[PDB]
Structure formats: structure tokens, C-alpha cells
Design a protein around this ligand. Structure first.
Ligand SMILES: CN1CCN(CCOc2c(Cl)cc(C(=O)N[C@@H](Cc3ccccc3)C(=O)O)c(O)c2Cl)CC1
Ligand SMILES: [Zn+2]
Ligand SMILES: [Zn+2]
Length: 451
């Protein structure tokens, strides 16, 4: 009876630096390779010191988000890793520009930096692309992927080694939004399921209500003579927000005086690359792209930097990064926090150790990048558009697949415990169904015996 080993080097009882080691029949597989946004230097990396890079046969990347691929240029260029790397086409294309904005936004010189834009550029040739619903075989390992929804190109990988099927969700959503599909429920049933836990103890409101709340907050800020800050990286959930705002400005002629800026040095390139992968979007937006392209915004202007910005009267700025560690969104927050008329809207999952996470604990004051202290008077709102499955969607996914083993990753420690308990209760009195739920810490291993 062969022994299957699953070990989180990252995202074990936390959100950040997703990296999961899978060991079975003389094969070593790594799932994702992200950084931790709430940490600095070598500490922001997964616990890579616990493995030998040269022994990794396969490296699979779920989606282009920094907490899943941010460490990838360091692992590909600055380690003994000689294995093969796979991404979907849209993920590889977006990976090149989000990481370029990331290195730009970053506040350190080449000495302290994990990698450069040249390392990122060079890492590209080392990455192979896979289509959805297509089998690839590497070192005896058979793999294919499903749609994850969540972000453009996001995949759920199914891995088969000697009759043993394992499904890794990456990050996923089971609802369609304006341009993305929902995640697929595989019909092939896995022995092991590795699933994200981000919003697993919560229940989503209607898309219509979240969109209305968001738009009403923005409108309320500009009405009172304020400027709206919406921190986001140029590629990710930002594309959904741009679609919502552009539609809202069309429906409200009394806002045609108020400008909307999508502020990023790479703004034009980001949108051009995004639009190249329309084939990976919803059926709705795929049919309408040649009728009226909604990605060709009527009310949103690009903005390269603070230098190209006339901060005269109310405006709405979408600026990188999302967690406001440094860069344009941090610069604008420092210029706008002291006026009570201004407002910040946080739309993503904020990780401990970031300004975005900090400002939600309602501080009296904040620290600038220069080191100074400023009073926090501007409003701070949290309206999530992070596109993660809620309890009903997680439960429904587990119930359709009924895998003997469920492994929780990518979630706050205490909420992951609560999710585990609820999944255990769901199958406690069921005699015909048997499911074992695990929630390992970083460096802890899940050991399973097969055959
Ligand atoms: C080793 N160090 C180097 C220095 N860095 C600074 C850059 O840190 C980051 C990182 Cl790594 C990732 C994100 C991110 O994934 N962001 C998404 C989602 C989102 C979140 C919140 C709100 C809205 C959206 C988006 O912007 O789409 C981010 O925002 C910041 Cl600030 C830390 C690691
Ligand atoms: Zn994600
Ligand atoms: Zn994630």
C-alpha cells in the first residue's frame, strides 16, 4: 500500500504564499508558488527550505494572483529546480504584467529584492501552457484542468498518479459575474480534494446587492465633494469593478462631470492583454464582444502616475496596489486620509501585516511611507468582490464529489477550524457517506495510505 503525502509550505492555516507539496510513487509535485503580502523578504516566501528544488518533477500554477505565483520567478531562476511548470494561456499572459506592476510598486533596491523584471522576463520561457479539458502527461503524472471562475484563466487542476485522483481548487467561485464563468463541478471523482477556505464560514448576498452597495458608496463620496479611492492591482478583480462603474456612470448623467481614473503605469498594456483572452470568459461577454465591447470604457480614463493627475474636485481613482503597502494607492491615501469627505473602498481579501488590513481596525492615525503620522478622517468601507466560494458553494462542491479526503488550505486559522467542524457535522449522522477533513499547519503533513 503506497503512501501519499500532502504538505503545505504556504497557505496552511493562513491566506498567503500558497505552495503545497504532493509526494507519491517517487514523484514530487508542487501546487502554486506565491508570496505573502503581509511579510517582507525571504519570510514572505513559503517554507521552501523544507524541500529540495531539484527533486520537484511538476509545478502547477492555479491562477495569476500574487499569493499563488508571486514567488515563481525566484523559484524558477534562483533555485536548483529543473522540473516542468504549467499554467493556462491567460494565466501566463497576465502573470508577465501583474508581476511587472508588483516589482514597480515594491519599495526596495535590487539588494533586498527577491527578483527583478529581468528574472521575471527570463522565467517566461521556463513556463508551458495548457488548455482547459486537455490531458498532459509528465513523468507518469497525468493532469488536466477545469474552470475555477474567480479570475481570468483560473484553473482547478486534476492530477492522476497510478489510479489515485487528486483535485486542487486553487481559488474558485461558483457564481458567474459580468465577464467570468462559474467554476465547473468535475464529473470525474477525486480520491483527495484540496480546497480553499477563504470565505467558507460565510454566506454571499446577491450580486445585484453587492453592486448597488458599491455604487451607492462611490456616489455618496463624490456627492459630498469627496474623492473616492479604490485600491486594486491593474489585473485581477479590478476588471469587474471597471465594468460596474462604467455602467453606473452611463446610467447617471449627473456624474458625467466626475472623472474615473484607472491609475497604473501599465494600464493600456493590462487592458490590451486582458482582451486577448476573451475566449476564456462568459458566454454572455463572448457573444457581445463584436457587438459592443464593454472593456472599451466610455467613462474611465487611464492615469500613468500622480504627475499626470490634476487633483481638482471630486474624482474616483482605481490604483495599485490593493493592500496599499506602497505605490500610487498608498500615495493617494496619504494625500486624502485627513479630509472627512474623501473615502476609501476596499474590495479584496486583506491579509494581516498590510495597511488595508490595519485601517479597518478604525485607527486614530496612520504612518506615512516617509515615517510621519497623519490623522485618519476619510471614510473606510469594505465591500468584497474577492470571488471566493461561500459555505453553501463549498458544501455543495464537496457534496457532489464526495471525496474520501478533504484538505483545507487558504483560510484564516479560526474560520478554517469552524469550516472543518461544519463539514464534519454534515456527514456525522450519514451512514452511506464517509469523509475525512484535514486542516494542516504550514510544514505539517497529511499522510494517506492507498491500496
Ligand atoms: C515580499 N513583499 C514585497 C512587497 N509587497 C508589497 C505588495 O504587496 C501586495 C501583494 Cl504581494 C499582493 C496584493 C494583491 O494580491 N492584491 C490584489 C487583491 C486585493 C487586495 C486588497 C484589496 C483589493 C484587492 C489586487 O490588488 O487585485 C497586494 O494588494 C499587495 Cl499591496 C509585499 C510582499
Ligand atoms: Zn486569488
Ligand atoms: Zn489566493
Amino acid at each position: 500500500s503506497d503512501q501519499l503525502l500532502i504538505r503545505p509550505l504556504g497557505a496552511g492555516q493562513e491566506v498567503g504564499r500558497s505552495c503545497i507539496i504532493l509526494e507519491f510513487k517517487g514523484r514530487k509535485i508542487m501546487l502554486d508558488c506565491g508570496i505573502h503580502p503581509g511579510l517582507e523578504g525571504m519570510d514572505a516566501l513559503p517554507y521552501i527550505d523544507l524541500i529540495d528544488p531539484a527533486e520537484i518533477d511538476l509545478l502547477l500554477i492555479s491562477h495569476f494572483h500574487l499569493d499563488h505565483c508571486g514567488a515563481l520567478p525566484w523559484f524558477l531562476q534562483k533555485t536548483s529546480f529543473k522540473g516542468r511548470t504549467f499554467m493556462t494561456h491567460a494565466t501566463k499572459a497576465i502573470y508577465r504584467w501583474l508581476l511587472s506592476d508588483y516589482v514597480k510598486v515594491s519599495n526596495i533596491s535590487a539588494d533586498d529584492m527577491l527578483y527583478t523584471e529581468t528574472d521575471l522576463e527570463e522565467s517566461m520561457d521556463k513556463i508551458e501552457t495548457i488548455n482547459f479539458h486537455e490531458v498532459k502527461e509528465v513523468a507518469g503524472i497525468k493532469f488536466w484542468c477545469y474552470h475555477a471562475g474567480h479570475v481570468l484563466g483560473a484553473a482547478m487542476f486534476m492530477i492522476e498518479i497510478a489510479g489515485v485522483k487528486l483535485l486542487y481548487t486553487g481559488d474558485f467561485s461558483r457564481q458567474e459575474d459580468r465577464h467570468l464563468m462559474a467554476a465547473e463541478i468535475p464529473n470525474i471523482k477525486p480520491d483527495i480534494l484540496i480546497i480553499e477556505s477563504t470565505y467558507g464560514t460565510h454566506i454571499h448576498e446577491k450580486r445585484e446587492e453587492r453592486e448597488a452597495r458599491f455604487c451607492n458608496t462611490v456616489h455618496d463620496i463624490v456627492n459630498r465633494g469627496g474623492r473616492g479611492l479604490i485600491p486594486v492591482f491593474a489585473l485581477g478583480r479590478a476588471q469587474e469593478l471597471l465594468l460596474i462603474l462604467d455602467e453606473y456612470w452611463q446610467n447617471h448623467p449627473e456624474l458625467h462631470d466626475i472623472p474615473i481614473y484607472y491609475a497604473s503605469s501599465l494600464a493600456k498594456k493590462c487592458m490590451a492583454v486582458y482582451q486577448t483572452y476573451v475566449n476564456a470568459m462568459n458566454d454572455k461577454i463572448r457573444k457581445q464582444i463584436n457587438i459592443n465591447n464593454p472593456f472599451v470604457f466610455k467613462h474611465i480614463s487611464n492615469l500613468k502616475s500622480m504627475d499626470h493627475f490634476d487633483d481638482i474636485g471630486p474624482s474616483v481613482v482605481m490604483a495599485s496596489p490593493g493592500m496599499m503597502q506602497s505605490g500610487l494607492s498608498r500615495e493617494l491615501f496619504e494625500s486624502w486620509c485627513t479630509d472627512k469627505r474623501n473615502g476609501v473602498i476596499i474590495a479584496g481579501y486583506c491579509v494581516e501585516g498590510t495597511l488595508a488590513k490595519h485601517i479597518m481596525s478604525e485607527p486614530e492615525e496612520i504612518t506615512t511611507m516617509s515615517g510621519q503620522k497623519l490623522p485618519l478622517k476619510m471614510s473606510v468601507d469594505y465591500i468584497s468582490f474577492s470571488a471566493h466560494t461561500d459555505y453553501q458553494q463549498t458544501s455543495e462542491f464537496i457534496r457532489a464529489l464526495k471525496p474520501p479526503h478533504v484538505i483545507l488550505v487558504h483560510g484564516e486559522q479560526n474560520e478554517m477550524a469552524r469550516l472543518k467542524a461544519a463539514l464534519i457535522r454534515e456527514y456525522e449522522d450519514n451512514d452511506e457517506v464517509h469523509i475525512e477533513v484535514h486542516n494542516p499547519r504550514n510544514t505539517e503533513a497529511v499522510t494517506l495510505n492507498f491500496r
